[PDB]
Symmetry: D3
Subunit: 258 residues, 6 copies
Amino acid sequence: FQYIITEKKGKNSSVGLIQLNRPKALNALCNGLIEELNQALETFEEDPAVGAIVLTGGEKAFAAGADIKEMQNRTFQDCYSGKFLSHWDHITRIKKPVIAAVNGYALGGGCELAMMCDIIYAGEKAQFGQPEILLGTIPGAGGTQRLTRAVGKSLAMEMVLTGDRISAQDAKQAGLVSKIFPVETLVEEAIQCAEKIANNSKIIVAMAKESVNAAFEMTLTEGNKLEKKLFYSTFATDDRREGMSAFVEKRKANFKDH
Amino acid sequence: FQYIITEKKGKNSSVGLIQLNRPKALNALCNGLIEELNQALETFEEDPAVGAIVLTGGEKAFAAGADIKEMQNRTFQDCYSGKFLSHWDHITRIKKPVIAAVNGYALGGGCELAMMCDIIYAGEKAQFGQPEILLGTIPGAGGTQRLTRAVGKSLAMEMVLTGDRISAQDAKQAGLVSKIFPVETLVEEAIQCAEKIANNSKIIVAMAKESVNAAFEMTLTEGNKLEKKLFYSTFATDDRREGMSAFVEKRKANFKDH
Amino acid sequence: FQYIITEKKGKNSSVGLIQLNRPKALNALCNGLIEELNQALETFEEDPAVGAIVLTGGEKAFAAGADIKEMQNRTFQDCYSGKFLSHWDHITRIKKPVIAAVNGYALGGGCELAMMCDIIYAGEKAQFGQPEILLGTIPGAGGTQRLTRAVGKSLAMEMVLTGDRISAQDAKQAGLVSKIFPVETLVEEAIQCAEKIANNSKIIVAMAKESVNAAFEMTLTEGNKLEKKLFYSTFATDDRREGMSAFVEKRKANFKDH
Amino acid sequence: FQYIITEKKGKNSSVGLIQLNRPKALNALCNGLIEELNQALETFEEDPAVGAIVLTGGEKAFAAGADIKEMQNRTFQDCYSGKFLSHWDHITRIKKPVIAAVNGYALGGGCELAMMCDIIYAGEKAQFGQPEILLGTIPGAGGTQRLTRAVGKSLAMEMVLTGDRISAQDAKQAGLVSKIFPVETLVEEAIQCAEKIANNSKIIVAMAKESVNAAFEMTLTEGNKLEKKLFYSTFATDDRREGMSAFVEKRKANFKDH
Amino acid sequence: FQYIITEKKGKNSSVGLIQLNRPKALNALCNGLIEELNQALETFEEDPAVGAIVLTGGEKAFAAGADIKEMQNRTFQDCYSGKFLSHWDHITRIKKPVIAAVNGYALGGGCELAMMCDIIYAGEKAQFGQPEILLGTIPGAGGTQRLTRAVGKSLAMEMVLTGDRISAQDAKQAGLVSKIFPVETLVEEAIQCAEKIANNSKIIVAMAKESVNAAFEMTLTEGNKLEKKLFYSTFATDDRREGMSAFVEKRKANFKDH
Amino acid sequence: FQYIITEKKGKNSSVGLIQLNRPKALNALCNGLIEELNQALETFEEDPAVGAIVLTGGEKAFAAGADIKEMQNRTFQDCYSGKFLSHWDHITRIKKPVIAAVNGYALGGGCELAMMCDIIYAGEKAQFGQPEILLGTIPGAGGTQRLTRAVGKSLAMEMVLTGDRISAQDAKQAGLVSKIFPVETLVEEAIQCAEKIANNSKIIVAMAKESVNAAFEMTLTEGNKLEKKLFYSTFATDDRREGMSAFVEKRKANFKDH
Ligand SMILES: CN(C)c1ccc(/C=C/C(=O)SCCNC(=O)CCNC(=O)[C@H](O)C(C)(C)COP(=O)(O)OP(=O)(O)OC[C@H]2O[C@@H](n3cnc4c(N)ncnc43)[C@H](O)[C@@H]2OP(=O)(O)O)cc1
Ligand SMILES: CN(C)c1ccc(/C=C/C(=O)SCCNC(=O)CCNC(=O)[C@H](O)C(C)(C)COP(=O)(O)OP(=O)(O)OC[C@H]2O[C@@H](n3cnc4c(N)ncnc43)[C@H](O)[C@@H]2OP(=O)(O)O)cc1
Ligand SMILES: CN(C)c1ccc(/C=C/C(=O)SCCNC(=O)CCNC(=O)[C@H](O)C(C)(C)COP(=O)(O)OP(=O)(O)OC[C@H]2O[C@@H](n3cnc4c(N)ncnc43)[C@H](O)[C@@H]2OP(=O)(O)O)cc1
Ligand SMILES: CN(C)c1ccc(/C=C/C(=O)SCCNC(=O)CCNC(=O)[C@H](O)C(C)(C)COP(=O)(O)OP(=O)(O)OC[C@H]2O[C@@H](n3cnc4c(N)ncnc43)[C@H](O)[C@@H]2OP(=O)(O)O)cc1
Ligand SMILES: CN(C)c1ccc(/C=C/C(=O)SCCNC(=O)CCNC(=O)[C@H](O)C(C)(C)COP(=O)(O)OP(=O)(O)OC[C@H]2O[C@@H](n3cnc4c(N)ncnc43)[C@H](O)[C@@H]2OP(=O)(O)O)cc1
Ligand SMILES: CN(C)c1ccc(/C=C/C(=O)SCCNC(=O)CCNC(=O)[C@H](O)C(C)(C)COP(=O)(O)OP(=O)(O)OC[C@H]2O[C@@H](n3cnc4c(N)ncnc43)[C@H](O)[C@@H]2OP(=O)(O)O)cc1
């Protein structure tokens, strides 16, 4: 890999860590980088030892956005071509949980990439923003959708129309991120979180993740019916039986992913 | 009742109070408890003197969830028998406002029961969580739906996939609960809130509640049209004439629930 | 104008400022006031020099609601004649960004008017509320819809069913408003915000605003597809090319709004 | 029962037949009739021998609507009493399939009752209509919703705004009913259909019914995701194994309902 | 009017007739024509004597679409900040029922105009189609939305992607139109239909129309709740009292429109 | 290719033909067959000479469903494995139009495959059905969703719950298919249809197809707004001008796919 670095972490290497490694362009997400990222994601998704994935960048930047230089001379017809900014949402197809550990800059595509993850942990100095408007364009990877649904209309409108950045504290207060940690312990805290998740049944975890994601795709009435079906279906797994036995039997549960 | 204690309270016994009373199992919501709860709710719903209902538990626990021992040996087929965990959402059918006064633990079904209520007040030491994942199952009573819609994706994912609990402070900050009070004044503050509601027209209050609930069942454009129709319909009541006349006449309004 | 005061305050006269000026009724929004407001909005919308609009009231009150005296003797039939409280949502049709600078009271229709704007800035002493329930009626201009989607069910239910007001601090914490400023610098800070927006391409800004508003009208999956189409379409403008080229050339760039 | 006749005219006694029996008022559905209908439905729903239910009326009329005499002296407040025209949609909660065998008149509430069923068979002389408009009211049991979704806007608008009736032929052509039979063989044909359904696994049939109903409650994208989950869940039943094995073994399948 | 003809044609002037009169361009809907159309619509909407509106064109053409010559040189820019092809959906805002009497050609904007109406009657020689694709563009006034919802995906796709026209018979079979009449009696039959509608309460009719239109804006569950609220609200009118009484009194009803 | 046969059949070789060729199992769609089908689809999608794709099978069968023998011994966990009946909806991702030419049997997965296509042409002897229920399972590839939306609740429920087949005539009347042709000329008529489509601008056609598909993914109000944005965007293409000038200049259309 020329733009990313990967390694297994956790107690039993149950955690997959992906680090964007293109320091020069503040981790600008060029087409090649996305290519590798999707590869890394796929390998971890296929590895039956990995139960969760952690995504992070540098200390100064998570990602400053997509590569502006690569899209400077593209056309409207270039957009309906199919080779312009494709595969950006492959991460939304990963069944396993993905935690974004954000230190420093998370702008444009960078902020959008973090929002595509299931959980976001931010470093004390992290900064989020959607500056697309300053470049004469608008967010094109969920910046007007995921952001608005987490932060509320007023703050989303202010961010998208002005291009202003918000601090990690503001992001936590608004619900964009769920935890803030010191710059130097961020990635570690993220890994510990991934570890807790990796310890649970992989099949049950995948169902829970689907259920939560469904909250943004249907009415509450139907969302609850779907959730109920998923709940019922867990009763067809062995881990559910094992899990509830471990409780009454007041012992630790040992899930075997099925 | 064996598992609950009821009693009218407030200004004119206009507030119905229901207290989960099964101390030994940290208020675990077994089938029998749910049975009584729905009875209590129905009586208060039918009592024309009661304008609001307050739901609370013990000081150490609101409810630690459904009874794990009652579902430990059930099956997938049992889920479709229609005899497994039935009648849990009867509370969502109550027309009158219901306030949850949460002290201590509010886990799994407990947290979900609180979220089914219209308003939530938490004690300084309250704790919310969805630990279903630790038992090899997922939330099955709105934990992946109502939670996500209030708290945002990141925190909802973190809570549901790890099983970690959050404090009352975190819950208020995230919008899960609207007010925090000292452990010993919680139930009273809740009752005072129920009292303000009980003082308003019961027919107008029921319409307002429906309108707010509709916010999670349709697009904003349609939600506004529905709200408009409801607003128009209030002009067919006497209390609306009495209320707007009491303002211009600089006097107290006397609603006749008509 | 007999109820409003207008003027262009931009540093380059690019911000349209509208001030509700009916001090005696705490800016109660009577039919005549709404008439002028829509006129003011339309003129600024048509003025190619104005890129953003700021809406504010007095120091003691933004607006205490619609005029109660004008609706106290209306009937149900009156409502369906389409000549009662009509034209209240013309502001939602304005394509240019609208910032609400709220000082003091913002109740009922006043709170709803603020929520119709794209961004809300509140003064340290601002107060929001939906006291309709106290008059024997319910919010009829989005108070049960926009409020709930920004603040969460619990707080929305509490506000709408009790009629209690919330402070500016609470509003910011809940996500109702995005910034709090001292009473005397509020309008100025709002204007500065409008200025930043006015500096961006008007055509790109209009698209960004549409995309954000779409977040409340469709599922996330479709919202993202819509956003993508809008993003593609920006590649058919000159300001986009000028905006990206300006970046790689380390030079500022101003758009000709096309 | 004074208004209905129930008898297991099924063959293996697996089909429950309910016949509206109030000849004098052309089967006008008064409160007492609905009362019994819901009872009959519940008993069959609980009877493990019954796999499907057939609903029919007289030869001249299925049902001429709700009892007009019973609602002539009601008021707006009455509607919000919580119980005026209640329990009119209990049939939509029955998990087993329900076939409506419609002979003669099916007007207003009668037409709506038929549309609430899963399948509709009409006699050659059947007539459908929503004459509510002629009584100075509108359909209030799905007549503007289920009708429109089956028949299309133009025909639904014409039917609802004029009150005109349509023939069985028109109903089949528009998709309101799926089959037309001679007046004297209608009920039998309906029973034969119920029989085919009753022969399949009750648990699988219940899932299939839910999936089809979901088509009117969510987007196609989510509808397909839900359907997929239900499909997967069938693999946790025994009947699904028996059913596919019976095909490969080229023999008849014996479903045990689990 | 330059390209329009209007006249009250009811037996009491209860029916407003609008006839597109631009023979030379096969009734091509140019900007000027749309202007007058919206005026005509508004006058009839305001006339308390008119209860329904009938819209028709010539015998050879209803409308061949929007004026192709008027949009030939316009560009992307013209589309955003433009009154370009504006006010085309004013007809969807009319509260009173609108019947489209279609003889001959109804293509592109013409077909779309017809679908915007509540009811469509077609002459034996009427032809519908969306040939936009042949001009290198797509339907932009509901041709891919209303058509699909009435006719089904297969026929809508075939019509939109090939540009092929369908006959009146095909349109009736598919549910696009609800009635076919001889070329000479079409307009007359349409007027008779408008008459039946005009005889009913104008306020109840407007509610029924809203309810039916809601069927395409929300889930079935919410659609039914909305319809129920509208039904309830009819009990606050006098005409509902009159209508139901006239039935029990076995006598004709006289609606006062309130 | 071991199970299919691909061919270029346009008048300019602009039509891609794919023929399922596994006669022995009545074209049962086994995993290998789906593999090739997706390959064939991808090649045609990438070939800039092909403007439309035609999908057909044998004269006796289009496809009898997925391979029952390949799923006979699979588990619930096999479903959540990640690769059981995978890649079945790749066809819904193809941007180019796809016509299904159905002769003979089109059951289960076969019927669902046909419904995934944009247009369906059926031979006089074609038969459609969803017999999954007879195998102790339910439709899992859109059979309860796409079928219901095209055919209506009654017929969809009857088909899915009984397993009964319907004729080509019934399918056309219900809107499932848009045209019926003699068994011998079916594929040829389908190709002619594909040809007409292939003659139009590829980029405009792709947009029209997206707009029609959006009709099942959002409310009518939003669907129309989306359509309008797509319509506007066509004004940024050359084919739009070429097409609109070709009409005004009374000459034949000149397309260049951009
Ligand atoms: C699937 N679909 C449809 C889609 C998917 C994705 C997207 C995404 C779009 C975007 O992200 S638009 C980009 C939004 N981001 C931005 O506007 C941020 C631009 N960056 C900045 O303003 C600043 O670099 C900054 C991050 C605030 C840090 O400033 P500072 O500390 O002064 O560093 P600075 O010298 O500017 O940056 C260092 C190097 O990184 C480069 N760089 C920064 N951001 C970059 C980016 N987004 N792309 C490429 N290079 C970038 C700089 O140009 C510079 O390289 P050289 O000039 O040495 O060649 C769209 C559609
Ligand atoms: C309608 N549909 C479809 C649906 C509707 C509802 C549901 C709901 C599901 C759930 O709620 S699953 C339950 C969620 N709860 C959990 O996962 C674990 C809950 N409990 C705990 O984590 C811990 O007990 C704790 C609340 C932190 C307190 O711990 P600690 O302070 O050490 O006390 P501890 O001794 O453990 O608990 C005291 C007693 O309460 C019992 N208990 C606690 N939680 C219980 C529960 N959820 N069910 C039954 N018993 C419970 C303990 O077993 C113990 O009783 P003995 O064994 O001594 O007889 C699903 C579907
Ligand atoms: C499109 N559609 C369908 C729709 C569109 C819009 C709407 C909106 C409805 C509403 O807003 S209902 C109204 C919501 N607002 C309220 O209920 C606020 C009522 N006001 C108050 O509680 C208090 O006035 C207050 C704002 C807390 C300020 O108290 P305080 O400082 O003591 O002043 P106070 O003396 O009460 O009021 C000063 C003057 O303002 C007037 N005023 C205050 N609010 C008013 C209002 N909403 N309307 C008319 N006058 C009002 C008072 O009557 C008084 O005038 P005088 O007759 O005494 O000369 C509905 C439907
Ligand atoms: C859950 N929620 C909120 C809701 C739930 C449900 C509903 C439902 C509302 C409706 O159904 S409104 C009613 C819609 N139905 C109608 O308009 C049908 C009215 N009936 C007719 O037009 C005619 O009776 C007819 C069905 C065409 C048959 O005519 P014909 O053959 O001459 O019979 P006719 O003598 O008129 O009627 C026979 C007897 O049945 C009675 N009847 C007929 N329909 C009736 C009805 N809907 N209600 C009560 N009685 C009815 C007649 O009054 C008469 O009784 P007597 O006068 O001899 O005492 C609303 C809301
Ligand atoms: C709110 N927004 C954003 C939006 C709102 C609306 C729209 C709507 C767009 C469209 O409707 S696009 C237009 C769709 N129409 C078409 O593609 C062409 C339809 N017409 C034809 O192909 C043919 O006229 C025909 C109806 C098949 C038969 O006509 P035929 O009998 O052969 O005679 P023909 O000479 O062609 O037409 C007679 C005269 O009407 C004119 N004409 C016909 N259709 C016309 C049209 N759509 N616009 C302007 N002129 C038209 C012809 O140019 C001719 O005038 P002369 O040059 O001879 O003086 C879009 C967006
Ligand atoms: C993405 N995801 C999650 C998903 C994606 C897809 C699916 C789809 C599921 C299905 O389609 S379930 C299957 C639905 N189809 C059926 O049930 C049709 C079953 N077939 C039949 O009833 C009959 O074969 C028939 C097509 C009506 C006519 O057949 P007939 O003329 O009597 O001849 P018959 O001997 O039965 O069939 C000829 C040969 O084809 C085989 N065959 C027919 N249909 C088959 C099928 N669906 N699978 C495998 N083999 C099949 C037969 O077994 C036989 O082979 P031998 O036994 O002689 O070795 C699910 C989920």
